[PDB]
Design a binder for this molecule. Structure first.
Ligand code: TTP
Ligand code: SF4
Ligand code: ZN
Lengths: 1010, 66
DNA sequence: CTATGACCATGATTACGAATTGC
DNA sequence: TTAAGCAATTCGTAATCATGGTCATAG
């Protein structure tokens, strides 16, 4: 629809180009100037034109040591290494490499690993023509033949085999989303006859570019173009949609320029004639071929930078591609920027111990960038459900019906289009509100990796990139060590608690950035690790090296500076600047998203240390890891000895303090005073006192005062939070307990939060007992919503769940009769509830889908929920304040309240009536019993105040759907399984149905036909 | 039949007769006739040549827990 | 017909393996 | 070709042991 502005008057012999790049690309090419791999770079100007840039003359290489013989110091054998062996038996050694310009170069460099000296050594630099020839050469120089005139006897290892685009960016100092400049007279626009579809197309040599480091005025962001879209399909009853039978009926698109607070384009393309919508364009077609063609032409002409959505990768784009393949439309799958290239669906998997394992499809688009917001949420955030409704409530606050809204009239289709446009608008709001893209651009500028790697890769490519960028400045080469496999080492210490309930303030002192500052201030690195022999026979121990608790020796900083101290120092300053910016916000959600930014930079700095100990990885050095955790243990026991030893009764102070807890970075010391001001004063004195026994940047700091405190086990405690004194209290802290885990029911987590509220804030155990009694009583009397009963568990890799029978695996692998095409896959979460049956050996035989127990009305196992979900967390919490008469107190508060329960042959009910007073079954329909007839006015009085309260609950719920829907004049259709509103509006109809019929036992209060 | 099942499905979604997914089909036909909006005399003449069948004398979504 | 012995199961308790969170 | 780390609390699930109850046989 709307086009980019027109590039007026660029003349290359006088004017430069200044543009900001988004994507890079590799390309094997003809039309050479009179190398074959030429590079592509796509970007945008400071105004809004689209620029493609072709870069020429770059070829991959690596290094290898020159062996000590008469060969690789003699030029005849250098060019003979270039020369091929013409023998017949060298077909395995000069064919797959063959005649390639590997070349011969002599340079003086060093290896990374260890500390041998300040002296370098000769290495050979071996270029290669193509990037897809470094793999057979590696298969032909190490295990292949290297008998060539006795120049290089096998073997010499390969060093610095890295990726092509990463080697380009390490070479020329270009980072992700960078400002690039072509100077005047260096670039030729009309040398390249147009093979792509951008406006400006330059054709430059790889030594002409100028990279501007992002800082000062070069810290801006260009006006990018962002698209979001959503589709609709018309299915059958029960049957989930399938790309060979179910047509695509509506596509809806939103588009904006980045930096402007509203969109500028709003389009909706439908398949029958429709009705107009104010604010958007509407076009209609009588066939699906025209609809797919129209969308492909719009996406070529608008030419967006970024494409977003929600589950567009695994549902939307391959559905469109398969549907275009079935209907024989040849011109659809050309969505990219290159004019002669069609797109294809390709599977990929990712797995780690940090995010688990996920299997995704990818679809190829060259030039353009994809950001599915579902994958960003699934990677960064740990939530309970990952539906669009659930995250839109958590962050903002909100198939067979559609097939008859489309086979109807055109106002129904207009309603369908407004629904689809709201769906297509929600991920834009989430992208701009959560500060996604600004943090992605800052991550790519601090680490130096492209913008597509932050959605596909892990935390290794970034630390490899930063280490290579720091390695070119002193002249070192990296080695290739690979081992399967070493052993584990010893991790962190935890101090033994003094368990219980405390009501005198405890002050928390901890170290900030512990492991990066250990690695900084004792000069630990790959490049300064001293081997056990190379100290000998030199004897200089003092101020030349140090010794660690695991046992290594490491050189002092008066000889070398390591590489990991400098990378860590850069990351630490970036996080410090993020916190300095965060210290001046007032909005809460903005404060937590800047907390998210600084959390991400601290995770990056700690993953630098975790790179060293990963024995399945790219470069492990477990000696360093052992030295780190040994220093950690030594320093925390130093802290505990010092804190408990100095402030004592004989040293003039009030009370000898005693440490109650410590977990590898923090110390919770109990001081003795019950005044929060005096505890805060002595705690600040203690933190600042103890910090002066270390190198720098090692510092201990005061952080909080808990008052009161509740310690249950290791990694399980709770307390109340004081930041200042006249800032009285902030909130609770629930570390580890049953209120922050997601393996349980909402009922149990709510009861634990409410019990700690009534028990820690108001200090009333009697209201707490009465609360827990009411929860158990309302459980047994069958008046608890089934939202509070839903359990969710993650469906991981299928073989560990083959090894032992679980409940959620049994529910998932059991398909439905309605739909063998929508079922949980690997990596998602399965929700279930437990119904009552008589198979007590197996709780995996009583699990059912919440919607299935909704539509089929199966009962609930209240004894399962009473003794297996609720009871034992309560016995954790309520015991330490009292004795074991407290277990008997809650099991007796159960006992006064356990005696009130409510509930083939079952169909043959005789509708046996019963007396309302004393429950005696009898013949006739009158409500009262003959012995209990006098007290009938009181028995009518009783239960009409129950009908009165059910009437008041019907009306508050069924008009809330009208305000959440938007309209007051049309029907509600919302079966949202993540809304408590749904199925709480279903049971009050039946309560009212039952309670209205019980009062017609009594006669009518008058006539009605008068 | 199979042509009489689309006439009723077309009467059920025309907005000028009312917002009807809680009641029967013949009750909505007589409600519009009282106010006399314009009920057509064909959605009546198939609700008379049938008995109490639940796929003629019921709204489209008379399943569906809404 | 009654008493004693044997078998069988059923229930409860303890010990081990696994999702999530604390660092 | 591709992947930060470990410590665990904690509860569930499975297996083993103990205890009684019921049935059958013998006197
Ligand atoms: C959270 C976390 C901690 N650690 C280690 C490194 C840390 O130095 C040590 C302390 O944990 P943390 O206190 O969580 O982190 P931190 O001390 O480095 O930073 P800050 O005080 O500002 O919050 O625990 C990891 O190795 N990986 C991790 O993911
Ligand atoms: S059931 Fe009602 S309140 Fe709940 S999400 Fe649906 S429309 Fe909104
Ligand atoms: Zn009675």
């Amino acid at each position: 629809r709307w086009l980019r502005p027109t590039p007026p008057a660029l003349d290359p012999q006088t004017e430069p180009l200044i543009f900001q790049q988004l994507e890079i690309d590799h390309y094997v090419g003809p039309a050479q100037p009179v190398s074959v791999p030429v590079l592509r770079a796509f970007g945008v100007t400071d105004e809004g034109f689209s620029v493609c840039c072709h870069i020429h003359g770059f070829a991959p290489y690596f290094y290898t040591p020159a062996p000590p013989g008469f060969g690789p110091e003699h030029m005849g054998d250098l060019q003979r290494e270039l020369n091929l062996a013409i023998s017949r038996d060298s077909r395995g050694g000069r064919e797959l490499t063959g005649p390639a310009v590997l070349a011969v170069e002599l340079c003086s460099r060093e290896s990374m690993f260890g500390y041998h000296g300040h002296g370098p050594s000769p290495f050979l630099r071996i270029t290669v023509a193509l990037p897809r020839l470094v793999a057979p050469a590696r298969r032909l120089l190490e295990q292949g033949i290297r008998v060539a005139g006795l120049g290089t006897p096998s073997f010499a290892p390969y060093e610095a085999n890295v990726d092509f685009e990463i080697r380009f960016m390490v070479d020329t100092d270009i980072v992700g989303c960078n400002w690039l400049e072509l100077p005047a007279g260096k670039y030729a626009l009309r040398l390249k006859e147009k093979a792509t579809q951008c406006q400006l197309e330059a054709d430059v040599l790889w030594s002409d570019v100028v990279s501007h480091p992002p800082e000062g005025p070069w810290q801006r962001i260009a006006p990018l173009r962002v698209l979001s879209f959503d589709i609709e399909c018309a299915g059958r009853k029960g049957i989930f949609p399938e790309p060979e039978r179910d047509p695509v009926i509506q596509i809806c698109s939103l588009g904006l320029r980045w930096g402007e607070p509203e969109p500028f384009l709003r389009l909706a393309l439908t398949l029958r004639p429709c009705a107009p919508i104010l604010g958007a364009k509407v076009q209609s077609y009588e066939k699906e071929e025209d609809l797919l063609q129209a969308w492909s032409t719009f996406i070529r002409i608008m030419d967006p930078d970024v494409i977003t959505g929600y589950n567009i990768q695994n549902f939307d784009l391959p559905y469109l591609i398969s549907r275009a393949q079935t209907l024989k439309v040849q011109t659809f799958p050309f969505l990219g920027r290159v004019a002669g290239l069609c797109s294809n669906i390709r599977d990929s998997s990712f797995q780690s111990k940090q995010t688990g394992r996920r299997d995704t499809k990818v679809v190829s688009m060259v030039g353009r960038v994809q950001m599915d917001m579902l994958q960003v949420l699934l990677r960064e955030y740990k939530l309970r459900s990952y539906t669009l409704n659930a995250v839109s409530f958590h962050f903002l606050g909100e198939h067979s019906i559609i097939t008859d809204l489309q086979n109807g009239n055109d106002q129904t289709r207009r309603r369908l289009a407004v629904y689809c446009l709201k769906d297509a608008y929600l991920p834009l709001r989430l992208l701009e509100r959560l500060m996604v893209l600004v943090n992605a651009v800052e991550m790519a500028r601090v680490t130096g990796v492209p913008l597509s790697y932050l959605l596909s890769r892990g935390q290794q490519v970034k630390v490899v990139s930063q280490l290579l960028r720091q390695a070119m400045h002193e002249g070192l080469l990296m080695p290739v060590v690979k081992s399967e496999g070493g052993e584990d080492y010893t991790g962190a210490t935890v101090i033994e608690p003094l368990k219980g309930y405390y009501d005198v303030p405890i002050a928390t002192l901890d170290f900030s950035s512990l492991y990066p500052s250990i690695m900084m201030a004792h000069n630990l690195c790959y490049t300064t690790l001293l081997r056990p022999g190379t100290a000998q026979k030199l004897g200089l121990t003092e101020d030349q090296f140090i010794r660690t608790p695991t046992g290594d020796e490491f050189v002092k900083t008066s000889v070398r500076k390591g590489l990991l101290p400098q990378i860590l120092e850069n990351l630490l300053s970036a996080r410090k600047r993020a916190k300095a910016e965060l210290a001046k916000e007032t909005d809460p959600l903005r404060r937590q998203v800047l907390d998210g930014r600084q959390l991400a930079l601290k995770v990056s700095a700690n993953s630098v240390y975790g790179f060293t100990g990963a024995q399945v990885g790219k470069l492990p050095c477990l000696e360093i890891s052992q030295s780190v955790t040994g220093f950690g243990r030594q320093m925390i026991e130093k802290t505990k000895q010092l804190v408990e030893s100095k402030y004592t009764v004989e040293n003039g102070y009030s009370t000898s303090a005693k440490v109650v807890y410590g977990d590898t970075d923090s110390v919770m010391c109990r001081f003795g005073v019950s005044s929060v001001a005096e505890a805060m004063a002595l705690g600040r004195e203690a933190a600042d006192w103890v910090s002066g026994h270390f190198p720098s940047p090692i510092r201990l700091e005061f952080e909080k005062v808990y008052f009161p405190y509740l310690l249950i086990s290791k990694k399980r405690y709770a307390g109340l939070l004081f930041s200042s004194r006249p800032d009285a209290h902030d909130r609770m802290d629930c570390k580890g307990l049953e209120a922050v885990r997601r393996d349980n029911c909402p009922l149990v987590a709510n009861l634990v939060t409410a019990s700690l509220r009534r028990l820690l804030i108001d200090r009333d155990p009697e209201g707490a007992v009465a609360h827990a009694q009411d929860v158990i009583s309302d459980l047994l009397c069958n008046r608890i919503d089934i939202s509070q009963l839903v359990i969710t568990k993650e469906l991981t890799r299928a073989a560990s769940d083959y090894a032992g029978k679980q409940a959620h695996v049994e529910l998932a692998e059991r398909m439905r009769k309605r739909d063998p095409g929508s079922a949980p896959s690997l990596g998602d979460r399965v929700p279930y509830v437990i119904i009552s049956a008589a198979k007590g050996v197996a709780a995996y035989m009583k699990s059912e889908d919440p919607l299935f127990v909704l539509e089929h009305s199966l009962p609930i196992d209240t004894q399962y929920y009473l003794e297996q979900q609720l009871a034992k967390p309560l016995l954790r919490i309520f015991e330490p304040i009292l004795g074991e008469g407290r277990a008997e107190a809650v099991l007796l508060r159960g006992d006064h309240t356990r005696c009130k329960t409510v509930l083939g042959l079952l169909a043959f009910a005789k509708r046996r009536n019963c007396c309302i007073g004393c429950r005696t079954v009898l013949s006739h329909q009158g409500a009262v019993c003959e012995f209990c007839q006098p007290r009938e006015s009181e028995l009518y009085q009783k239960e009409v105040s129950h009908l009165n309260a059910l009437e008041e609950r019907f009306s508050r719920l069924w008009t809330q759907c009208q305000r959440c829907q938007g309209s007051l004049h049309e029907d509600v259709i919302c079966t949202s399984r993540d809304c408590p509103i749904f199925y709480m509006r279903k049971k009050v109809r039946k309560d009212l149905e039952d309670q209205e019929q019980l009062l017609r036992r009594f006669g009518p209060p008058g006539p009605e036909a008068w | 039949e199979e042509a009489e099942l689309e006439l009723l499905r077309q009467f059920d979604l025309a907005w000028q007769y009312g917002p009807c997914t809680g009641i029967t089909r013949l009750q909505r036909w007589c409600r519009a006739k009282q106010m006399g909006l314009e009920p057509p005399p064909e959605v009546w003449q198939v609700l008379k040549t049938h008995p109490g069948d639940p796929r003629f004398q019921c709204s489209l979504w008379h399943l569906y827990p809404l």
